[PDB]
Design an enzyme around this catalytic site. Structure first.
Site, PDB file in Angstrom:
ATOM      1  NE  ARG A 183       2.322   7.063   5.412  1.00  0.00           N
ATOM      2  CZ  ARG A 183       1.900   5.887   6.040  1.00  0.00           C
ATOM      3  NH1 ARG A 183       2.644   4.831   5.273  1.00  0.00           N
ATOM      4  NH2 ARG A 183       1.110   5.446   6.731  1.00  0.00           N
ATOM      5  CG  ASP A 196      -0.411  -0.030   2.989  1.00  0.00           C
ATOM      6  OD1 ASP A 196       0.882   0.208   2.347  1.00  0.00           O
ATOM      7  OD2 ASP A 196      -1.283  -0.704   3.332  1.00  0.00           O
ATOM      8  CB  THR A 233      -1.631  -4.714   2.007  1.00  0.00           C
ATOM      9  OG1 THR A 233      -0.414  -3.357   2.312  1.00  0.00           O
ATOM     10  CG2 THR A 233      -2.180  -3.543   0.616  1.00  0.00           C
ATOM     11  NE  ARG A 269      -1.182   3.132   4.373  1.00  0.00           N
ATOM     12  CZ  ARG A 269      -1.836   3.005   4.006  1.00  0.00           C
ATOM     13  NH1 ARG A 269      -2.589   2.482   2.996  1.00  0.00           N
ATOM     14  NH2 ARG A 269      -2.913   1.549   5.455  1.00  0.00           N
TER      15      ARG A 269
HETATM   16  C1  LIG Z   1      -4.614   5.705   5.080  1.00  0.00           C
HETATM   17  C2  LIG Z   1      -3.680   6.882   5.887  1.00  0.00           C
HETATM   18  C3  LIG Z   1      -3.290   6.039   6.632  1.00  0.00           C
HETATM   19  N1  LIG Z   1      -2.759   7.594   8.012  1.00  0.00           N
HETATM   20  C4  LIG Z   1      -1.843   7.231   8.978  1.00  0.00           C
HETATM   21  C5  LIG Z   1      -2.711   6.227  10.202  1.00  0.00           C
HETATM   22  C6  LIG Z   1      -2.293   5.226  10.359  1.00  0.00           C
HETATM   23  O1  LIG Z   1      -1.137   6.173  11.880  1.00  0.00           O
HETATM   24  P1  LIG Z   1      -0.173   4.778  13.291  1.00  0.00           P
HETATM   25  O2  LIG Z   1       0.841   5.167  12.013  1.00  0.00           O
HETATM   26  O3  LIG Z   1      -0.170   6.138  13.274  1.00  0.00           O
HETATM   27  O4  LIG Z   1      -1.230   4.010  13.181  1.00  0.00           O
HETATM   28  C7  LIG Z   1      -1.547   5.227   9.734  1.00  0.00           C
HETATM   29  C8  LIG Z   1      -1.111   3.307   9.025  1.00  0.00           C
HETATM   30  O5  LIG Z   1      -0.468   3.418   7.455  1.00  0.00           O
HETATM   31  P2  LIG Z   1       0.161   2.180   7.856  1.00  0.00           P
HETATM   32  O6  LIG Z   1      -0.941   1.784   7.588  1.00  0.00           O
HETATM   33  O7  LIG Z   1       1.298   2.363   6.206  1.00  0.00           O
HETATM   34  O8  LIG Z   1       1.407   1.435   8.793  1.00  0.00           O
HETATM   35  O9  LIG Z   1      -0.803   6.298   8.729  1.00  0.00           O
HETATM   36  C9  LIG Z   1      -3.583   8.410   8.167  1.00  0.00           C
HETATM   37  O10 LIG Z   1      -3.142   9.488   8.311  1.00  0.00           O
HETATM   38  N2  LIG Z   1      -4.247   8.820   7.261  1.00  0.00           N
HETATM   39  C10 LIG Z   1      -4.638   7.711   5.631  1.00  0.00           C
HETATM   40  O11 LIG Z   1      -5.434   8.097   5.000  1.00  0.00           O
HETATM   41 CA   LIG Z   2       0.367  -1.431   6.041  1.00  0.00          CA
END
Ligand SMILES: Cc1cn([C@H]2C[C@H](OP(=O)(O)O)[C@@H](COP(=O)(O)O)O2)c(=O)[nH]c1=O
Ligand SMILES: [Ca+2]
EC number: 3.1.31.1
Length: 129
Positions: free
Chosen positions: A75, A15, A35, A29
């Protein structure tokens, strides 16, 4: 929403992908999906699926939603397309990603993605097997 040009720099995992957008390298992202990490079950399969899609594309595009365009890690948050086919949807359709991270105001494709997830779940694909 509208599609904008980008070019592949490097595949990363199921992802995330590194793209050049407006001439600058950025990690994207994929909106509305999750994923498995590479170290988790179906993580290597999700990575390979996204890698193949973006490496084989003649044309990559990104589409931002109406809300946040970058997350707290810097990202880019977008829907990614490979020769017109949405990566985000294709992962969900194949049972390699769950619909997830649905924040109000960046959720334009939520129902399209949920319909794909229901299909993958009915077919018992991958994560749903
Ligand atoms: C997909 C997405 C992730 N995020 C943040 C939430 C999650 O925070 P945390 O890192 O604090 O868990 C993280 C999950 O991404 P990943 O699944 O790439 O780890 O990215 C957003 O803020 N906005 C989004 O639209
Ligand atoms: Ca992931």
């Amino acid at each position: 929403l509208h599609k904008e040009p980008a070019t592949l720099i490097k595949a990363i995992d199921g992802d995330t992908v590194k793209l050049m957008y407006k001439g600058q390298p950025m990690t994207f992202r994929a909106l509305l999906v999750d994923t498995p990490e590479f170290n988790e079950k179906y993580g290597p399969e999700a990575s390979a699926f996204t890698k193949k899609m973006v490496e084989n594309a003649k044309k990559i595009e990104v589409e931002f939603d109406k809300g946040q365009r970058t997350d707290k890690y810097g990202r880019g948050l977008a829907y990614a397309y490979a020769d017109g086919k949405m990566v985000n949807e294709a992962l969900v359709r194949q049972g390699l990603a769950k619909v997830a991270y649905v924040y109000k105001g960046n959720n334009t494709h939520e129902q399209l993605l949920r319909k794909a997830e229901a299909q993958a779940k009915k077919e018992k694909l991958n994560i749903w097997s």
